[PDB]
Design an enzyme around this catalytic site. Structure first.
Site, PDB file in Angstrom:
ATOM      1  N   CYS A 132       0.817  -1.209   0.000  1.00 23.63           N
ATOM      2  CA  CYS A 132       0.000   0.000   0.000  1.00 23.63           C
ATOM      3  C   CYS A 132       0.854   1.263   0.000  1.00 23.63           C
ATOM      4  CB  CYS A 132      -0.985  -0.004   1.178  1.00 23.63           C
ATOM      5  SG  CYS A 132      -0.292   0.012   2.840  1.00 23.63           S
ATOM      6  N   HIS A 167      -2.227   0.919   7.979  1.00 20.21           N
ATOM      7  CA  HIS A 167      -2.669   0.924   6.588  1.00 20.21           C
ATOM      8  C   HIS A 167      -2.600   2.351   6.058  1.00 20.21           C
ATOM      9  CE1 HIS A 167      -4.818  -0.065   2.951  1.00 20.21           C
ATOM     10  NE2 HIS A 167      -5.947   0.518   3.318  1.00 20.21           N
ATOM     11  N   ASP A 191      -8.602   3.577  -2.196  1.00 20.77           N
ATOM     12  CA  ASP A 191      -7.813   2.575  -1.480  1.00 20.77           C
ATOM     13  C   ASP A 191      -7.424   1.472  -2.451  1.00 20.77           C
ATOM     14  OD1 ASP A 191      -6.777   0.536   0.195  1.00 20.77           O
ATOM     15  OD2 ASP A 191      -8.227   0.947   1.786  1.00 20.77           O
TER      16      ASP A 191
END
Lengths: 222, 300
Positions: A132, A167, A191
């Site tokens: 991520c 995250h 996302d």
């Protein structure tokens, strides 16, 4: 006169001298720091702190001083980053189109590492996958280059195993997405992990059982 | 004493008259009266915070609050993991501009910095923001549309590669004095009005046909910065013409063996490519000697 992207180490140390002289006389930090003696372009105190951080980082990693101290972080040209993305995923002009193409072609893979050379991550993206942090750093400049506001948010999310995971994802505003007048924490969630792993729509974090704000931007460990 | 809070009916009425004022006068009001025919008013930025807390409450609880507190706006918060960026999107630039304009309207002066994002985090100096606005306006002129991004700091060429490419043409050098000397015995000057050219071709033209003062300045600035000097391009006028003044660009250089960097830049060492390659004048002298005046900094 363009505000410079970088200045000589000579100029940086002169800025430090004028910064300290101001503190000496006035007992507090200046709000801005003039680049050159005599006036002209200036940087905010926040930006000057960034510059000192880059000097410190370069000196630690290389055991020598840089010749050049960047005023803002060096980046490849935005039109190239957009064009390279388009070469891989096809044509897109909106963040909603891009999300759709990502959802259909890109993959997620966890790996700490953080090294995201665009050409390299562009290939991993459609094969093994990227994490991520690489995702956020790859897609923020493309989505900004489409004209959107983008901010990287650091969060904790609770997933279907009921465990909390640190995250990162993008908060996006402008055009068809959230009004940039809103607080950033209310912008649209974009996302990469929702798109490529957990199958959630644009606007939804990758896990649905809870979300907590940790900070803004990517924490670069020291 | 000022009211500490208002009820939801009063707040919805203030919000109505606030929106009406906006549509009618094409600007926000600097104060919002609690009652339409009333004495007490709430300052615009306090009222905008009221609206934000109200919208946050509805977003969280799916219902309107019973009371809206009246609280002056708070200080910004820092963001140590966000850098001031090289550029912003047009979306963010217009939001920055909207907040800069409201600051002027409310406070009657310009802010010292403009935050990239509302609420805190990285910021640019007022000076940088004015420069962003000027280049935004110029883009709106040349093209006929808004740009998609607005540079905080326009890109400059990466320095190690520029030094490497110059060393592939002039050989090794370590100081700005030595480089000037090499330039004076190898490079050539050619007058032309080609606004830029600096790619590799410029380095080839350097030692064959020649280059002009703008190409030379853009070529030698990052190289000399790469050697450890500070460099600022000066736009000047120099007395030669038919004999009534010419416009000219040269480099001001400071550091190491050249001028003290703490001097104002217009006292730095003159490093003039035209002096080195055409008029045969030494380092520190402009290309013409009846020498005229200062026009600006940077390539126009």
């Amino acid at each position: 006169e363009n505000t410079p992207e970088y200045v000589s180490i000579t100029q940086f140390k002169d800025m430090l001298s004028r910064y300290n002289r101001f503190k000496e006389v006035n007992g507090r930090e200046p709000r801005v720091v003039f680049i050159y003696s005599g006036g002209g372009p200036s940087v905010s105190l926040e930006t000057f702190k960034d510059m000192c951080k880059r000097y410190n980082q370069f000196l630690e990693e290389n055991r020598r001083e840089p010749r050049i101290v960047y005023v803002t972080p060096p980046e490849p040209p935005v039109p190239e980053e957009v064009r390279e993305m388009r070469r891989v995923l096809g044509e897109f002009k909106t963040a909603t189109q891009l999300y759709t193409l990502v959802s259909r072609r890109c993959k997620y893979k966890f790996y700490y590492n953080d090294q995201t050379p665009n050409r390299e991550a562009l290939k991993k993206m459609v094969t093994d996958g990227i994490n991520c942090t690489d995702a956020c750093q790859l897609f923020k400049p493309v989505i900004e280059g489409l004209g959107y506001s983008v901010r990287i948010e650091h969060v904790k999310v609770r997933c279907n195993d009921n465990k909390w995971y640190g995250h990162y994802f993008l908060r996006v505003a402008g055009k068809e997405l959230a009004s940039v007048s809103l607080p950033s924490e209310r912008w649209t969630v974009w996302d990469y992990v929702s798109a490529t792993k957990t199958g959630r729509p644009l606007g939804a974090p990758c896990c649905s059982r809870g979300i907590q704000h940790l900070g803004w931007g990517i924490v670069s460990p020291k």
